[PDB]
Amino acid sequence: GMTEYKLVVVGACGVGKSALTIQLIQNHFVDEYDDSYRKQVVIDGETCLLDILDTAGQERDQYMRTGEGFLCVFAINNTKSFEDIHHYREQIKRVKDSEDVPMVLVGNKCDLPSRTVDTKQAQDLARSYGIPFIETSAKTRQGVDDAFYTLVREIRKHK
Numbered sequence: 001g002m003t004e005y006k007l008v009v010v011g012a013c014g015v016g017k018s019a020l021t022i023q024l025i026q027n028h029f030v031d032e033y034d035d036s037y038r039k040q041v042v043i044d045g046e047t048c049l050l051d052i053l054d055t056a057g058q059e060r061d062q063y064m065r066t067g068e069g070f071l072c073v074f075a076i077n078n079t080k081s082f083e084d085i086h087h088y089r090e091q092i093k094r095v096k097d098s099e100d101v102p103m104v105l106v107g108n109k110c111d112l113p114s115r116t117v118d119t120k121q122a123q124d125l126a127r128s129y130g131i132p133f134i135e136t137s138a139k140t141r142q143g144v145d146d147a148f149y150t151l152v153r154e155i156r157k158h159k
């Protein structure tokens with residue numbers, strides 16, 4: 001039937017993995033609560049179904065082996081979350097057993113004023129991995145559709 005793309009949101013705890021996913025599926029912003037979500041979207045004329053796989057703390061290859069594309073998310077107010085991207089990127093290539101895994105670098109919480117990671121820092125890392133970089137904010141919905149839709153276009157090109 002219609003193509004179904006399996007997406008996985010990886011990143012440190014509290015960067016915005018859940019809020020970005022909830023903002024995409026339900027148009028809702030989450031502050032504090034405690035999964036798997038599906039949604040039908042239209043990208044570049046074709047209609048498809050998005051299956052999002054949000055990640056928590058320790059538990060993991062079975063979660064990543066099913067993911068076709070991966071979102072590596074960090075928060076601009078958290079300096080540590082940026083250096084964690086290397087380990088996440090390092091594990092994606094191992095579990096998927098490939099170096100050209102479709103992924104997008106996402107810098108969340110661009111709404112916040114206190115910028116601890118300048119813009120010129122994350123994009124050069126995305127150039128190192130050869131992947132796009134998109135500033136997002138789960139509060140203002142800025143770039144939320146962009147990050148997920150771009151990840152789908154990466155998956156459609158590798159075929």
Ligand SMILES: *CC(=O)NCCNS(=O)(=O)CP(=O)(O)OC[C@H]1O[C@@H](n2cnc3c(=O)nc(N)[nH]c32)[C@H](O)[C@@H]1O
Nearest residue numbers: 013014016017018019030031032033109111137138139
């Ligand atoms: C370990 C783990 O991932 N736990 C998830 C539980 N977090 S939560 O409270 O359910 C939402 P989350 O995004 O994970 O929490 C992070 C905090 O940062 C704020 N946030 C999230 N996205 C944001 C955004 O796009 N813009 C802005 N300005 N703030 C954003 C949330 O309110 C959370 O408190």
